[PDB]
Amino acid sequence: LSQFKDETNPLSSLRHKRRISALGPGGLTRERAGFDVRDVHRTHYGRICPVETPEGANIGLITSLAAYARVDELGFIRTPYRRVVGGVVTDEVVYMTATEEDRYTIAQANTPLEGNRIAAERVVARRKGEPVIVSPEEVEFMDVSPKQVFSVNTNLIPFLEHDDANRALMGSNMQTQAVPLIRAQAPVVMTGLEERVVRDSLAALYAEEDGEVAKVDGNRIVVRYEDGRLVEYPLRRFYRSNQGTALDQRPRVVVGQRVRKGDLLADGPASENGFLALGQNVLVAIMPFDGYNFEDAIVISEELLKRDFYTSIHIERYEIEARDTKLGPERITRDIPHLSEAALRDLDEEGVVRIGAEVKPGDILVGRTSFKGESEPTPEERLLRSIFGEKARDVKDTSLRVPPGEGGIVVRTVRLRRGDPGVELKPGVREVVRVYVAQKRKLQVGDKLANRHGNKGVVAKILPVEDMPHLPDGTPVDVILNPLGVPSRMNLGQILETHLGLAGYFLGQRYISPIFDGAKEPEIKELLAQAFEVYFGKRKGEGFGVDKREVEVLRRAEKLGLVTPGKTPEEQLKELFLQGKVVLYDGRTGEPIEGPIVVGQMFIMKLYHMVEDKMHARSTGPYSLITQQPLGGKAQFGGQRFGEMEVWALEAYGAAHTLQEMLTLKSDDIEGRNAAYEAII
Amino acid sequence: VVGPQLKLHQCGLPKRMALELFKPFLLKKMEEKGIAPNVKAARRMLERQRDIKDEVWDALEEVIHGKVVLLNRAPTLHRLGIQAFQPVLVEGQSIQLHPLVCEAFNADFDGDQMAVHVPLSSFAQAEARIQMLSAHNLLSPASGEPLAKPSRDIILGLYYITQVRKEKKGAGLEFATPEEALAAHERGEVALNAPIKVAGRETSVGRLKYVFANPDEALLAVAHGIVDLQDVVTVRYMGKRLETSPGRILFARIVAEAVEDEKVAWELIQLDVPQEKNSLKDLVYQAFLRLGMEKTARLLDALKYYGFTFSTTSGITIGIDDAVIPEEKKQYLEEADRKLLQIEQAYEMGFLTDRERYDQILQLWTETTEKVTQAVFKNFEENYPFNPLYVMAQSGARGNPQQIRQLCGLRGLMQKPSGETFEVPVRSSFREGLTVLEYFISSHGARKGGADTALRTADSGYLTRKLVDVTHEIVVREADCGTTNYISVPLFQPDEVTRSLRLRKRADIEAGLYGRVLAREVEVLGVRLEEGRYLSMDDVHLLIKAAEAGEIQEVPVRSPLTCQTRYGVCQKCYGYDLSMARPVSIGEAVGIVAAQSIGEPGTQLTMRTFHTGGVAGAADITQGLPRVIEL
Amino acid sequence: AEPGIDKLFGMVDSKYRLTVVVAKRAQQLLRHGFKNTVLEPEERPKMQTLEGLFDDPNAETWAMKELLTGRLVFGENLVPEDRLQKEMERIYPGE
Amino acid sequence: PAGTGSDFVRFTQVVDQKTLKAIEEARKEAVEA
Amino acid sequence: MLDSKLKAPVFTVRTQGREYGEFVLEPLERGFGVTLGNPLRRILLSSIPGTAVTSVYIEDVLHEFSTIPGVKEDVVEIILNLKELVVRFLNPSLQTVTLLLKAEGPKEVKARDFLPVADVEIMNPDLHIATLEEGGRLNMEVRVDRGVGYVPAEKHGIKDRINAIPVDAVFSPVRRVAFQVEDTRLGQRTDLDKLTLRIWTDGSVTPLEALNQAVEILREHLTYFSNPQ
Amino acid sequence: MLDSKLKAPVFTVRTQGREYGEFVLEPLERGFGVTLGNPLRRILLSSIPGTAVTSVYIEDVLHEFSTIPGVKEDVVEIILNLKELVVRFLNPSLQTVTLLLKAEGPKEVKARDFLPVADVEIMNPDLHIATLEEGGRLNMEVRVDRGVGYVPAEKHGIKDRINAIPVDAVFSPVRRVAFQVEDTRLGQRTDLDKLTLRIWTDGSVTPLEALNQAVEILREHLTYFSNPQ
Ligand SMILES: [Mg+2]
Ligand SMILES: [Mg+2]
Ligand SMILES: [Mg+2]
Ligand SMILES: [Mg+2]
Ligand SMILES: [Mg+2]
Ligand SMILES: [Mg+2]
Ligand SMILES: [Mg+2]
Ligand SMILES: [Mg+2]
Ligand SMILES: [Mg+2]
Ligand SMILES: [Mg+2]
Ligand SMILES: [Mg+2]
Ligand SMILES: [Mg+2]
Ligand SMILES: [Mg+2]
Ligand SMILES: [Mg+2]
Ligand SMILES: [Mg+2]
Ligand SMILES: [Mg+2]
Ligand SMILES: [Mg+2]
Ligand SMILES: [Mg+2]
Ligand SMILES: [Mg+2]
Ligand SMILES: [Mg+2]
Ligand SMILES: [Mg+2]
Ligand SMILES: [Mg+2]
Ligand SMILES: [Mg+2]
Ligand SMILES: [Mg+2]
Ligand SMILES: [Mg+2]
Ligand SMILES: [Mg+2]
Ligand SMILES: [Mg+2]
Ligand SMILES: [Mg+2]
Ligand SMILES: [Mg+2]
Ligand SMILES: [Mg+2]
Ligand SMILES: [Mg+2]
Ligand SMILES: [Mg+2]
Ligand SMILES: [Mg+2]
Ligand SMILES: [Mg+2]
Ligand SMILES: [Mg+2]
Ligand SMILES: [Mg+2]
Ligand SMILES: [Mg+2]
Ligand SMILES: [Mg+2]
Ligand SMILES: [Mg+2]
Ligand SMILES: [Mg+2]
Ligand SMILES: [Mg+2]
Ligand SMILES: [Mg+2]
Ligand SMILES: [Mg+2]
Ligand SMILES: [Mg+2]
Ligand SMILES: [Mg+2]
Ligand SMILES: [Mg+2]
Ligand SMILES: [Mg+2]
Ligand SMILES: [Mg+2]
Ligand SMILES: [Mg+2]
Ligand SMILES: [Mg+2]
Ligand SMILES: [Mg+2]
Ligand SMILES: [Mg+2]
Ligand SMILES: [Mg+2]
Ligand SMILES: [Mg+2]
Ligand SMILES: [Mg+2]
Ligand SMILES: [Mg+2]
Ligand SMILES: [Mg+2]
Ligand SMILES: [Mg+2]
Ligand SMILES: [Mg+2]
Ligand SMILES: [Mg+2]
Ligand SMILES: [Mg+2]
Ligand SMILES: [Mg+2]
Ligand SMILES: [Mg+2]
Ligand SMILES: [Mg+2]
Ligand SMILES: [Mg+2]
Ligand SMILES: [Mg+2]
Ligand SMILES: [Mg+2]
Ligand SMILES: [Mg+2]
Ligand SMILES: [Mg+2]
Ligand SMILES: [Mg+2]
Ligand SMILES: [Mg+2]
Ligand SMILES: [Mg+2]
Ligand SMILES: [Mg+2]
Ligand SMILES: [Mg+2]
Ligand SMILES: [Mg+2]
Ligand SMILES: [Mg+2]
Ligand SMILES: [Mg+2]
Ligand SMILES: [Mg+2]
Ligand SMILES: [Mg+2]
Ligand SMILES: [Mg+2]
Ligand SMILES: [Mg+2]
Ligand SMILES: [Mg+2]
Ligand SMILES: [Mg+2]
Ligand SMILES: [Mg+2]
Ligand SMILES: [Mg+2]
Ligand SMILES: [Mg+2]
Ligand SMILES: [Mg+2]
Ligand SMILES: [Mg+2]
Ligand SMILES: [Mg+2]
Ligand SMILES: [Mg+2]
Ligand SMILES: [Mg+2]
Ligand SMILES: [Mg+2]
Ligand SMILES: [Mg+2]
Ligand SMILES: [Mg+2]
Ligand SMILES: [Mg+2]
Ligand SMILES: [Mg+2]
Ligand SMILES: [Mg+2]
Ligand SMILES: [Mg+2]
Ligand SMILES: [Mg+2]
Ligand SMILES: [Mg+2]
Ligand SMILES: [Mg+2]
Ligand SMILES: [Mg+2]
Ligand SMILES: [Mg+2]
Ligand SMILES: [Mg+2]
Ligand SMILES: [Mg+2]
Ligand SMILES: [Mg+2]
Ligand SMILES: [Mg+2]
Ligand SMILES: [Mg+2]
Ligand SMILES: [Mg+2]
Ligand SMILES: [Pb+2]
């Protein structure tokens, strides 16, 4: 029932903390069960999100409770419900047990309310489990808000209403995978819990009571409360999350500043200014490229890397032990027996690697010397040593090297040698050596980014700002999203976000759109209307009108049906802009992209690399003790598995030898793989 | 990660990965060159990253030349689950895969990881790049139908280019007759009334205005801004005065060029329509049989390219004003709404049994729903032929009839936990807010679907195991088995509507006679289908067309069911389909090639309860995988 | 795809057999000495860092490039099993 | 037993017209005295 | 000269400071403004030379992920701010210039704080380096170079002082380019392209300068079409 | 010269006949092949001057859609065939040349039938104008001009003789342009554009010639950026 805290980022830890699962003790439910437990029962309302469950084998088994849901006196999930005596609705609230809720006629938030007055004769309520049109005079209770129907992890989605519950799930789990970027950034459009998430989770550092600031270090903010007291507030500089992501509190308050009780003094790993930030707002054009964004692939603008935009600080921790063998203790000295000093450089401190040293794959992170054979020396190796220099250190080079994949620059090291302080070193363990390595992971091909609606894609190509889609005025688009990944999946909400986003870019503002009660198509079209003047108005004054291109795309557009024929280009482009699309010119040719293309500000996050992304590739290596098949571990990549399903693949084809080798020369033939390598050599 | 310009033939594999994989081959090569004195040397030379002289990459680059590698997918469902490619060493972490083959391995690029193996022996290399290469296994072991085709983005490209437009019909221009009709609607079109694309039967003024002499003449005018590609113009191709669009003419060339037998390029293409994935798929299958294998491969990327290109310019994107809602939705809703009140008053009295009410109400919505569906499309069909959304669905690209319905019209009848569907529909679309309870009502059926995938993402070898256990030994090793006991394939089917003979469907017959070996002769429409002849899909097209006239009701054809070769199956009895399209080549693992084609589609089939249904009153048959099991 | 793969396929009675010939041809193209080839002088194999494929890049790309021509002979029982290897060594130098 | 494992093709040897003449030369040598 | 040639392009310019600079040019025959503006835009962003911080050395700091006492910002936020610094040196002899700076006590270290270098100028004086508090020691050396394009700190790996930390190099002096092609009615026929491209620049070089270099890179490239084969 | 300059563009040519002509050129730094090919393509189609029929006058024919007795083809197919006619004149003095022709009786009126004009030549002689029968009278005047790009017969509306009918103006010797940018490898750095553009031409001029004129129109345009104002 207990596992590694999922602290990929603040939201993940918060969501993991408030998660429910039936898998348990034995007295309580096991795995042959589930079809009726795994379904979303009726009572699951304001009690358990329908959507927040895992995607796959575990479904309905592990679920997270809804936003306002609280376990009162003995664990029966109660949810909020305000009272409505007669045609009157109250600000009083009853945390109700799942059973007593059957007894009453409850109603939804979305019911015209003049205050205490219910406003429409036939307005919806839902008796125990069945949707029912009740009258204002039977409406005993009402629902506090849409927020209670789902979880905290789901309520953060913009216009959830427009997204298929199936895909909103992917959205909610996507966020739990959000990796803190050096450049945090709250979305151009938020739901309303971003603030509460960082605050209730414990990301940012808040001010106890009012006062002034004394000192502001990169390491501490000793504030002065007006009570005649002052406290030093350390800031976890660069600590190692269980999952590798970085947790640093960057001070947002200047020297000598009167603070408002409860205001951010420092920001959490990923918050902008007290607001959750798991990604970055980026201008996006939503069209097809030369198939670079094929099924689900995304093309990225090199311009995004120039700015340290999608860069994330990660910290890997390598460790090595000085073990006690009966052959002789494993020394940890700067003596790596067989070949060079160049390799020794960064191992500076006699043994351990010097701080601030860039370590590339293969370099020595720590040196160790163990003894050579099991019990006996070596007759052939005896002659060789004698020939060039008999006296040689007859010890093995078992030093902790950087694994294929990557290293960064050493930032911290630990060494628990003899005469330990208050530590527990295991038996046989003569002494341990930890080395923390940190690396700036820049957005690169292969990385996967995804918006809160489930558009989860991988970066296929980083384009030179030189040629990707560019707007009438110089600004280029950062990311180009394929449209074909929107019809099948049903989430028009991303297309609703991009539009409102386009307005926010020229309007220089961020908005907040609640879940079932938020922005509306008419209001959006309104803001675009204001955006048209900032985008085209400056254009009119700055000195110039419309292009051959701009007019050309208008023609093909009126023949399309996006613009009322006859109206003037000025008036035509406004119409066209209000629709959410504007004319873009192919940065490669300079010619237009026949037909208006939508563009805008969409919040896209980058997802965390699991240990699987380290591109595995294994030539020759260790082998299991009993079963003689290929096995990895520390440095030599483990072998890939060739399953029956795969076997049949080959069996289907005439691949006779290919199947033979998979069984013989590659994995199990002892004598085989041997003569195999040498033969190849 | 998708590698757009990569050809089927190749795949981009990270140099860094290539180094480890082909290390031994590299080591040796280092010694052939001045880079390293010996192996041990060469090894230490590569033990650390910072130590590699870029001459090593040139050694690796040179080693790989010609050799190929194998790539594998998460579920290895069929033989094509593994394919061979030529490594084109590339920078970084990801593996660059060709787009066409993404159909074979079910792979999207949100994070799927593919494995890769190295055939060592000169033998393993030979089979791997000769018979296991991706370009060579183009048709599937399940259906003769092409597996590798212009799938999602390429269709879209190739479609938009070939499509004709239609605008405002005010002045009744039906020009095929007056000379004054030509002049008047030529002038009127110049004016603001008649369009360039007017329904006027013979030639809307758009054809009256421009005539293009040579082929190219047609596209230059386009480049200059006179003719949009999707516009209806007239042109003088070889021997004909063909009234066909800029785009359609261009497409004709693209193929005509991909394969230089220009006339053989026109014989197998239909420029009479927008190119759908079916017209394209068909284009490939033809190209294959007709020309040659590899030349087909050229045409494939030919399409892949222009498809990608035309695509980006067409500028199809998705805004909110795209999914158009019908104006009839409000009507069909209210009309069905008030009818719902009748059913209630009819109940409020005592006429309908508590059940009658329900079943009658669902009936109402099942129809009303279905009604707005044809409505929305009829809207796009009449008013916006070029809507980004709807187009993706009609071109073989992406979109579902039932899906569009959920955005534009409305998603309307969710079922409860158990299965007894709700009495109340979900009145909304995704365009406007799918409300809270509408959302929660909708949520139920979501889990069931998810719960169903999990029990199934479980074991994929389950079904295909059984088939490979009872079928692996089966292999083609033959001489014409001389036992001609045969099977007769039907062309007519009996009972849906009790007893009304009917021509079997189009496909079902295709799957019964395609590339089989006639047991006995057949004198059908005029032609004489000799005995033992392998019947091509074009022959399987003759027989149906003859059954249409009424000359044949069965078809004598050899098959695995009547075989004499004990542990084997012969050429004449198996038939046509190697991945290739000729006869079967002896020594083909047919047993497993069969066991697979059936283990993959099974994953699409439902999974409620194996020995299906549940004891309750009268649950009568069994659907989905549960039955295929029972069978 | 690959050069005249169809032409090749047509030259054999069974698909799988063509693969066996090429592979066995590639075998001896290396073993008895790589200059055991029927086609070489003007336009036979070639790789570009120089035109250096003339000596030893891919063995079977040759086998195929040869079999596609009409000089080889692949039979079921063409030349007696053990005496073939003897005669070949006697006649092909480069070790 | 199914792919190239087919005894139908497991055995198949290759010739050069040059090695063809060489082997009949071996047979010619078979003539004694 | 009087008729078709004197009707030649009236290259008019409008430029403020060293950053912004509009450039108009008309009349131009059919579809040329576009034809010109586009390549020039492609050059202005990639081919033009520049100057940007390439390495940094802090007093007692050994790696980029540390934080300095009395200094609110952390080393990573500072090396970031340095990428924002735009300098300009006058001639070739100045390939690599190390700018020096050292400040103590309650001060807002701004770019004007660097000690003046003879041939080099700092266009970005008020840019913000740090907020030091009492007992705030900061003595650094920030290198500066002349290059082209974007160079990851990983690719160069600069080495003046062993405890130093490299910075990502972005040299295009051009911040953004833009071009409009609006019709112009010059009296005979009306189809007339009128090109006008707006160039923005960090200050290192100037819009006008950049444009010149740009057109040259294209000319030099049109020359490469000389010896057939 | 050895390193960055000798690594200069290898302009390779392949031209068969005056019509088709491939042109390769590599290596080229990042995104340049495209940068070059595109403008050259925009020029090759519009600026490369040319010559094509601009108007036609038939003996007794008044409208565009009539048919002449003894003449199988119709005026629309004939005026169509004339768009296929490619002529070539030697100097400026020849702006508008009306080519004259008149033939009677069972004859296949071919382009060689036009009476010779001193400063003008017909590259398209055997081209086929008409198939006359008995009592086949055909006396026409086909105008010819020098212009650029495509001009709908609607846009010009030529007026030599009131019963005359204008033809769509096809002046570009270039039939179609085609450019590809495929990667190529120079040692250490793999990102290398390789431009190759395919030019098609009516025969009047040659691919090679066209390309030359094209690059020149761009060069001359890059100098129009000289005198500020
Ligand atoms: Mg559990
Ligand atoms: Mg028990
Ligand atoms: Mg249940
Ligand atoms: Mg998930
Ligand atoms: Mg009440
Ligand atoms: Mg309250
Ligand atoms: Mg109820
Ligand atoms: Mg009542
Ligand atoms: Mg759901
Ligand atoms: Mg779901
Ligand atoms: Mg709130
Ligand atoms: Mg103070
Ligand atoms: Mg900590
Ligand atoms: Mg606050
Ligand atoms: Mg971000
Ligand atoms: Mg150290
Ligand atoms: Mg020694
Ligand atoms: Mg421990
Ligand atoms: Mg000990
Ligand atoms: Mg603007
Ligand atoms: Mg702003
Ligand atoms: Mg809008
Ligand atoms: Mg203006
Ligand atoms: Mg003003
Ligand atoms: Mg990693
Ligand atoms: Mg390793
Ligand atoms: Mg696997
Ligand atoms: Mg590519
Ligand atoms: Mg390409
Ligand atoms: Mg490539
Ligand atoms: Mg390694
Ligand atoms: Mg498919
Ligand atoms: Mg598959
Ligand atoms: Mg996936
Ligand atoms: Mg083998
Ligand atoms: Mg192939
Ligand atoms: Mg098959
Ligand atoms: Mg299949
Ligand atoms: Mg008629
Ligand atoms: Mg009107
Ligand atoms: Mg009409
Ligand atoms: Mg015409
Ligand atoms: Mg006709
Ligand atoms: Mg056309
Ligand atoms: Mg053609
Ligand atoms: Mg046909
Ligand atoms: Mg038709
Ligand atoms: Mg077919
Ligand atoms: Mg065929
Ligand atoms: Mg064939
Ligand atoms: Mg293009
Ligand atoms: Mg009605
Ligand atoms: Mg009653
Ligand atoms: Mg009743
Ligand atoms: Mg459809
Ligand atoms: Mg409802
Ligand atoms: Mg029957
Ligand atoms: Mg029936
Ligand atoms: Mg019936
Ligand atoms: Mg049919
Ligand atoms: Mg019969
Ligand atoms: Mg008969
Ligand atoms: Mg007959
Ligand atoms: Mg018969
Ligand atoms: Mg008969
Ligand atoms: Mg008969
Ligand atoms: Mg008969
Ligand atoms: Mg017979
Ligand atoms: Mg056959
Ligand atoms: Mg046929
Ligand atoms: Mg009948
Ligand atoms: Mg046969
Ligand atoms: Mg019953
Ligand atoms: Mg039943
Ligand atoms: Mg080939
Ligand atoms: Mg042959
Ligand atoms: Mg030789
Ligand atoms: Mg050759
Ligand atoms: Mg040569
Ligand atoms: Mg020998
Ligand atoms: Mg003898
Ligand atoms: Mg004798
Ligand atoms: Mg001014
Ligand atoms: Mg001025
Ligand atoms: Mg001004
Ligand atoms: Mg132009
Ligand atoms: Mg700079
Ligand atoms: Mg100090
Ligand atoms: Mg430190
Ligand atoms: Mg000076
Ligand atoms: Mg200098
Ligand atoms: Mg200053
Ligand atoms: Mg100086
Ligand atoms: Mg100076
Ligand atoms: Mg003028
Ligand atoms: Mg003029
Ligand atoms: Mg120059
Ligand atoms: Mg050199
Ligand atoms: Mg050279
Ligand atoms: Mg060179
Ligand atoms: Mg070169
Ligand atoms: Mg040639
Ligand atoms: Mg000319
Ligand atoms: Mg007529
Ligand atoms: Mg004649
Ligand atoms: Mg004269
Ligand atoms: Mg006649
Ligand atoms: Mg290109
Ligand atoms: Mg030439
Ligand atoms: Pb048989």
Swiss-Prot record, chains E, F:
GO terms for cellular component: cytoplasm; DNA-directed RNA polymerase complex. One of its GO terms (biological process) is DNA-templated transcription. Its EC number is 2.7.7.6. Keywords: DNA-directed RNA polymerase, Nucleotidyltransferase, Transcription, Transferase. Residues 1-229 are annotated as: Alpha N-terminal domain (alpha-NTD). One of its GO terms (molecular function) is DNA-directed RNA polymerase activity. It catalyses: RNA(n) + a ribonucleoside 5'-triphosphate = RNA(n+1) + diphosphate. It is an enzyme of class 2 (transferase). Belongs to the RNA polymerase alpha chain family. DNA-dependent RNA polymerase catalyzes the transcription of DNA into RNA using the four ribonucleoside triphosphates as substrates. The N-terminal domain is essential for RNAP assembly and basal transcription, whereas the C-terminal domain is involved in interaction with transcriptional regulators and with upstream promoter elements. Homodimer. The RNAP catalytic core consists of 2 alpha, 1 beta, 1 beta' and 1 omega subunit. When a sigma factor is associated with the core the holoenzyme is formed, which can initiate transcription. This is DNA-directed RNA polymerase subunit alpha. The gene is rpoA.
